[PDB]
Paper text:
Clr4 is the sole H3K9me2/3 methyltransferase in the fission yeast Schizosaccharomyces pombe, and recent evidence suggests that ubiquitination of lysine 14 on histone H3 (H3K14ub) plays a key role in H3K9 methylation. The SUV39 enzymatic activity facilitates the transfer of a methyl group from S-adenosyl-L-methionine (SAM) to the ε-amino group of lysine 9 on histone H3 with high specificity, thereby converting the cofactor to S-adenosyl-L-homocysteine (SAH). Our structure-function approach shows that the H3K14ub substrate binds specifically and tightly to the catalytic domain of Clr4, and thereby stimulates the enzyme by over 250-fold. We combined biochemical and structural methods to decipher the molecular mechanism governing the stimulation of Clr4 by H3K14ub. These experiments identified a ubiquitin binding region (UBR) in the catalytic domain of Clr4, which mediates H3K14ub binding, and mutations that disrupt this interaction interface lose heterochromatin function.
Based on the Clr4 structure and sequence conservation, we further chose to mutate three phenylalanines that intersect orthogonally with the GS253 mutations on the surface of Clr4 (F256A, F310A, and F427A, referred to as Clr4-3FA). The Clr4-3FA mutant showed very stable biochemical behavior and crystallized readily. To determine the effect of the 3FA mutations on the folding of Clr4, we solved the structure by X-ray crystallography. These efforts resulted in a 2.46 Å structure of Clr4-3FA. When comparing with previous X-ray structures of Clr4, we observed no significant difference in global or local protein folding between the wild-type Clr4 KMT domains and the Clr4-3FA mutant (RMSD = 0.37 Å). This indicates that the Clr4-3FA mutations do not induce significant structural changes. In contrast, Clr4-GS253 and Clr4-3FA showed complete loss of binding to H3K14ub under the same conditions. Comparison of the specificity constants ksp shows that the efficiency of the UBR mutants on H3K14ub drops approximately 27-fold for Clr4-3FA and 48-fold for Clr4-GS253 compared to the wild-type. In contrast to the enzymatic activity on H3K14ub, the activity on unmodified H3 peptides is only mildly affected resulting in a ksp, that is, 91% of wild-type for Clr4-3FA and 78% for Clr4-GS253. The model suggests that F310, which is also mutated in Clr4-3FA, is unlikely to be involved directly in the interaction with ubiquitin as the N-terminal residues 253–256 shield F310 from interacting with ubiquitin.
Author numbering: 195 to 373, 376 to 461, 473 to 490
Amino acid sequence: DSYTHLSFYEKRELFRKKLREIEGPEVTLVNEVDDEPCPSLDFQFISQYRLTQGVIPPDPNAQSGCNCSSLGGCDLNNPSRCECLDDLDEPTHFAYDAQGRVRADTGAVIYECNSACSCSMECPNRVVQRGRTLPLEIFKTKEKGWGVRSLRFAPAGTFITCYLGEVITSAEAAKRDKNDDGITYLFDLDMFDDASEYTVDAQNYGDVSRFFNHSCSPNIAIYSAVRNHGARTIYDLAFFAIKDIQPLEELTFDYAGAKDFSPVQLRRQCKCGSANCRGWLFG
Ligand SMILES: Nc1ncnc2c1ncn2[C@@H]1O[C@H](CSCC[C@H](N)C(=O)O)[C@@H](O)[C@H]1O
Ligand SMILES: [Mg+2]
Ligand SMILES: [Zn+2]
Ligand SMILES: [Zn+2]
Ligand SMILES: [Zn+2]
Ligand SMILES: [Zn+2]
């Protein structure tokens, strides 16, 4: 809707109310830049993928887990016991260190524990699952529309959040004609399969990561975090810090290979401002 019957204050207060109702750590809104009161009030905040028509989810009959049974669950210092890690090359280790941060030597694929595993929810191998721990702020950037930044220092390897949205088909992707601003592009789930062609559209439903902007010099990156032992047509898109992040520093990831820069079928350039900037065109 245009929401013309709602005033600057009413609209902004409604977006704030909407943020307050998110579970886990606080999310704030700020626009010290222009008088855009808030992002779309239609947008919904979800804690897991919102599946759609024709999207076959992983079969819980193909689920397997582990036998590690001790205090705190699975033992960082003994990864060769944990069946959840068998698909890794030697030397097997968990993706996470004693600090609960992704290791510098961890590859693109994180293998987390699942409902099938005997370990409790406090397992070191359920970091993504336990979700965001940092307070975040949706703020108005100078040239790139809305953006997100942390209120707290974040060491490299710190888990931030997952990219959520409607999971949709190629057929559905074509049916949605996307152009205007606050238009997200699609995030292919192509890390493993190609037949699936499942994609994540955060226009109407998503996470705070829906407001993360592109940088050619990013401070966060996507780790494909797999739990379910079926076919991997659907898996978690997990943001971790790849650089130490100052308070109030804009969270940016490299969209290339992940989030599209144009609608599936005039243009606006990259404003990340990095010296290495590739001048990537949007739309
Ligand atoms: N480096 C960059 N330069 C210019 N526009 C950018 C950008 N990174 C992201 N964007 C914009 O952000 C969109 C993705 S959705 C991210 C949040 C968006 N800024 C909003 O206001 O809701 C892109 O389609 C593009 O329009
Ligand atoms: Mg890709
Ligand atoms: Zn475990
Ligand atoms: Zn285990
Ligand atoms: Zn396990
Ligand atoms: Zn750039």
